[PDB]
Ligand binder design. Structure first.
Ligand SMILES: [Cl-]
Ligand SMILES: [Cl-]
Ligand SMILES: [Cl-]
Ligand SMILES: [Cl-]
Ligand SMILES: [Cl-]
Ligand SMILES: [Cl-]
Ligand SMILES: [K+]
Ligand SMILES: [K+]
Ligand SMILES: [K+]
Ligand SMILES: [K+]
Lengths: 362, 362, 363, 363, 362
């Protein structure tokens, strides 16, 4: 047990086998659920005090809710005794996800008054996946009508575009946001025996043709269909996220690029005990850009079963954040980045997006 | 004596026998009533400067008023010469309780424009108990029509639910919020010879199934009837509050669990002189969560006639709060928690909820 | 002899009316009130309150601040005939500002209604009514005559229709000091018009001497609450000082009776007789608790009762720590000790007695 | 050349004879005109960044613009090569003067939504005078209709009032504000051959009646028609401003009171090297009240051709304000008062209000 | 390589031959493009977080956007592999340029609700050049309709005025703002084969006879048609900007005045290694007024092929601003003026306004 760590990497990877979350993961669930009014998963309502206290920028809240929801789905898998709870939290996640505080930047930016009609795939992709994960966990048909509507919007929009996928802001295409949307199609198919996921092959072909540097195993920052532009910089956090979720749809894809990605962005240090991730090429700096390179790589390492890298990244990320457990509840005194406890939570419990996809009934 | 205590425990428990409140209680009543414009009970108006000066969060104001009200009800029982004053203050309590500042979080959260028509038992439970306590204290029929209306709302909603009781926010069930509502049914019955309280039996049975840990004498945090989830943490403040209220309706219920509760949560320290209460299991930390576990156990100790625990808790709670009496009015320089002077006032004077329920007329 | 931080002697203040001249520091207070464009409190009839913002007056207190200036001004007019025109001008501005929504708006914000004079709210409309009258008394102007008569009718009818003697402030809140202002306003109206609205005063003085006063301690209780019959069980010095002072203008024997009991209950002489402090309530040693105005209003009461020794003692307590200075012939205080500080010190230095204001010569 | 001074007094008084402004006056025109967006005369639009930067209070902006305008009118008279610039700036001045940022205090105070209809001579007096000076300087008829409209309003209001002149705020009469309005009438007559200025004799008679203290040669602060009150304090800045403008209409008037004014208010110090001005009587403090006594006396000294007092006042005002010229543009590090660079500019170029009236016609 | 410099002047002037931008220019494009939400060219929405982080005053945003855009047009000409990206960024520039946050000052100042209808050539001149440069780079007709509408407005307004050109604020005439407008006509003619540029000769004759001091090679500050007033100060930033753009339309004109301009305003110092520019005559102070003399003279030196002055100016401007490259992205610790990174960016890549006019079709 490394100094400033709460549990061993072995303990995290063993949770499914044990059918029990680690104590610190339980304490994170306590943070998420325990205290009236200010815990993030206290209420269905449009109250965002937990995110206010964390100083989460408005635009980041949707992702915060999304990654919490994904971690919750894995908890449901790990411990049957917490599955009812995880499902309750997922219900709340979907409710909050639909509040105007969360999706409102779309309207404020001038893009329209409806966040799902088109193009907000950074938002509606996550929402569609959450609809799905909720139903897999709980078997409830509470959101089935909305799930169907949103899934058709997504499929149709994919089908109509000359490129494979959907944009975020108009004329902005992000490979990582698309992989949420496609993953959500796989989940809808599992629930209903449909074949929306058929679109995935063209998408995987497309992103491999111009959006990736195959040699370095890294995706370019973004693509912009009307100009044809592919932004010249490769992005680690973008690649880590995308490979993690693609791994749940096409494992050979991610297994192909994963060791090249590591070669390109990952800096092991401190005699092998720790690792840092560079955000782009031509630099020595770790976690530039949005600062999420190391955290998303922590999730990718978990998805790929790479326990050594996971242990290395966590040894870098968690200790300076200064974790403590007070009254059986987890706090970080110095969160190192945006989405910090969210991504650390997700990575600690992540069962694989492939496993989430094929979740047992009840 | 101890140091920073204002009166002995024997003195607080003797108030009803002596038909006189202690001087620190009178000094608390002065804080509540004395200074123009800024004392809590200055006018029926929708002005909350007293609460602004205390930095009371908006969501907590409804509870502050309610617990002031319950304490004033006992004051009425203790000293006949103060019963008119207590009744006046209860009249102001009810009026302020109905101000949008107090219940407006229900509408801001997106739950509805009307705070009593469905759910929201956290608010309308207290309001209905207050309607009844005002009438018991004063004999006045000023709110009788509103009282009948809300009592029937609560009665109908109980009858209509598959689970025993009523939710607060949609799909959030709390045992302590329900105990207020049921107790309000008993008060209505006492005033009108009705039998709304018959529903209590089913409620007491229900909360003793999945909502309690019978051996530890501790309730779980909450229940969520849509998903069936019971949140896996036991909660001291929740249990102390619930047992205190239930003791006025089914004393054997509370008498049965009270010693186990103490075993579970209460830490005696300083060679028997003091006591502090853990909020949940699996920690050594006292007063986590909302931080009210000791303050509510103080009220419970009073309700159960446990003078030893009362004394121990007050020695923990009151001295670090640095009480002073300036111009015959009580102030605490460092309130240790939310609802601090409200809960200490209430505990000091509390005659027992059964006694309040059987209050003789004016 | 002039105490160490004082601006003028007590003898000088009590002599002003005799010499027909305000003291220099009273004149400098009037400069503060009138001199500097835009920010002086009596600069214009407009609904600007920058003077009060610069003083950090809380909103609910502005009406009282305006009212107590007005009462001081009425005495300046009685003291110095050359300043009577000025005094009347400031009273004109006081009435105008009194009617601005910034001043009475708390009534609507507390949910009590959109019209501040229609019913109740005697804490506001009592003062307004007295000010209407003092204005016409001082100036002879009939500018506010129509609304003066209208409000006097409101107050008269409200008193007639209430089971208890008087009128509430907030609904179900009855305050003896606020009522004293309203009744006095009826005396002023009668002085102006020869009428007999003041006839209700007898029943009121009988009422408040029942459950509202502790006759032995010469002190009023905090408040009365008619729907429950409650009388708050604390006696209040500022309440009593203010009430006795204004009642002395209508029934001087009432205040003669309770004044020495009041002093025994509340007043603490200290510093070898040189100073005095006023305790706000019973059962405490602490001075000026509660609203913090006990000493300030007793200062007014001492003036009204001609008690120069007590006046001198309180002013020695109140004025020096506040550090008065005169800059460019205008008075400032560096550390005002309480709300309404320069208002009440001004009023007490010029106060001619409410009875004498009633007998003010015509023009 | 004293330290902290930019040019000699001789240099300022010689500008007109030499047909050129001094270099510091040019540097001041640069501050006024040079920098995109933030210079005060950059744009005709309703932008007030320059005044925000100087922390000009909203109520004072109208006087700032106006005093700039009066100085620009003298620049036109001093230097024919700057007359086009001067006129362009005066165009902008009139245009900004009409923005709601500038006159809106009239509506906020609750005095009405139209700032020229009645009263408010503090605002529309300067506006009318500016309309006039703009047209004297440029010959442009851009504002003729508005100018004629306002001039009739002002004329009809004077004709209708019992007192000679027009109030500012309701029931507030100020002589200095009236002096601008009357001067604006002289300018209108000079442009149009009319005789609106005929009302000046009645006005000069009236202000000499109860508004002035003959011995001290000083006006009282203000007059209030309703109560008849005349505020009992004399004001230096009020007198300086008024005597300067009246000197343009009736020089014997200002000549009669000027030496009296100086004995009352002006303190020469530093062995005759400096002077400063007291704001009211019975104080030794200089520049109390609004703090403009010295700055306006500087203008008065110029108007009266009193080079010695001008030099003394400027030695008092300019050095501690730390003038520097950076990139050919004037800045003061520590302006000692409101309207500081406006009033120093105006005093440094002022050709006399009488000379402004007799301006040679436009091409 | 001088101390504090990122690249040699040789390197900047060689970019077009190498068909590659220097690494620091690429790091500037990263600042403009890389980080989600906060980079200035992230999306075409009406969000200006980038400029809020820079504390760009509102009135200055439009020139920021315009000078970025001109910079991007030269990137497109320099590096074919970056032309698609340059096109995408220009699309975003035009989009944000039309946002009310950018032109709104026109309405707030009381000048009207329509920012292009009449006057305001300071805004719509830049907009019109940007329309054309966008279409030159991309070939897209996305804005062609509004380009034609605005070009006609400018054309009709020039034809209707007694003086040659168009005012900014009513009655305010600026030679630099007019120069942008005339250049925009040349760009429109290149795209459509029209002859709008014919009005240029009358403009050049007029500004040369009336608004320039031929001896000093310097334009006066501004002209005011109604009063006939010409502000009596000459302005370096005004002149540097105007000669730079005129050089794209009439190279002989600017060549005539350029050596005189430098004589008047440019101070060489530090043994010929640095230079700084006085904003006006009769002073020794450099960069007074708007503080842009040196930065615009840097652009002008680039336009005129003057590598010596370019190097001297850049040695003055860049080192005290303390450039650094973090995570392959350029940041200045201490920008010495408004529009700082925009104008250094533009000067470093600027291929000449004449070269832009002759841009190959893609
Ligand atoms: Cl946390
Ligand atoms: Cl105690
Ligand atoms: Cl308290
Ligand atoms: Cl004061
Ligand atoms: Cl300045
Ligand atoms: Cl930068
Ligand atoms: K609760
Ligand atoms: K009161
Ligand atoms: K004035
Ligand atoms: K410009």
């Amino acid at each position: 047990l490394p100094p400033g760590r709460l549990a061993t990497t072995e303990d995290y990877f063993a949770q499914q086998a044990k059918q029990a979350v680690t104590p610190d993961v339980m304490a994170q669930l306590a943070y998420m659920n325990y205290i009236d009014f200010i815990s993030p998963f206290y209420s269905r309502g449009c109250s965002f005090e937990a995110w206010e206290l964390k100083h989460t920028p408005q635009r980041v809240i949707k992702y915060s809710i999304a990654f919490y929801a994904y971690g919750l789905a894995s908890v449901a898998l790990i411990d049957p005794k917490l599955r009812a709870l995880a499902g309750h939290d997922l219900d709340i996640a979907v409710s909050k996800m639909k509040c105007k505080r969360v999706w409102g930047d779309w309207e404020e930016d001038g893009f329209g008054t409806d966040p799902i009609e088109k193009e907000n795939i950074m938002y509606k992709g996550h929402l569609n996946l959450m609809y799905g994960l909720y139903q897999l966990v709980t078997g409830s048909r509470r959101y089935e009508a909305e799930h169907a509507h949103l899934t058709r919007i997504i499929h149709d929009e994919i089908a109509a575009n000359p490129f494979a996928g959907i944009v975020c802001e108009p004329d902005n295409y992000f490979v990582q946001c698309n992989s949420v949307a496609y993953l959500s199609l796989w989940v809808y198919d599992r629930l209903h025996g449909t074949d929306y996921r058929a679109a995935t092959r063209a998408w995987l072909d497309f992103i491999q043709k111009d959006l990736i540097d195959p040699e370095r195993g890294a995706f370019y920052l973004s693509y912009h269909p009307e100009s044809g532009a592919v932004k010249p910089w490769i992005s680690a956090y973008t690649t880590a996220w995308t490979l993690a979720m693609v791994h749940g749809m096409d494992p050979a894809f991610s297994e192909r690029y994963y060791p090249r990605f590591k070669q390109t962005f990952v800096e092991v240090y401190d005699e092998g005990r720790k690792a840092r991730v560079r955000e782009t090429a031509g630099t020595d700096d770790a976690d530039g850009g949005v600062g999420l390179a190391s955290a998303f790589t922590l999730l990718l390492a978990r998805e790929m079963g790479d326990q050594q890298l996971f242990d290395q990244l966590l040894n870098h990320l968690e200790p300076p954040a200064k974790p403590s457990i007070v009254s059986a509840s987890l706090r970080y005194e110095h969160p190192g980045s945006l989405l910090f406890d969210e991504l650390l939570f997700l990575a600690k419990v992540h069962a694989g997006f492939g496993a989430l996809l094929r979740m047992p009934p009840p």
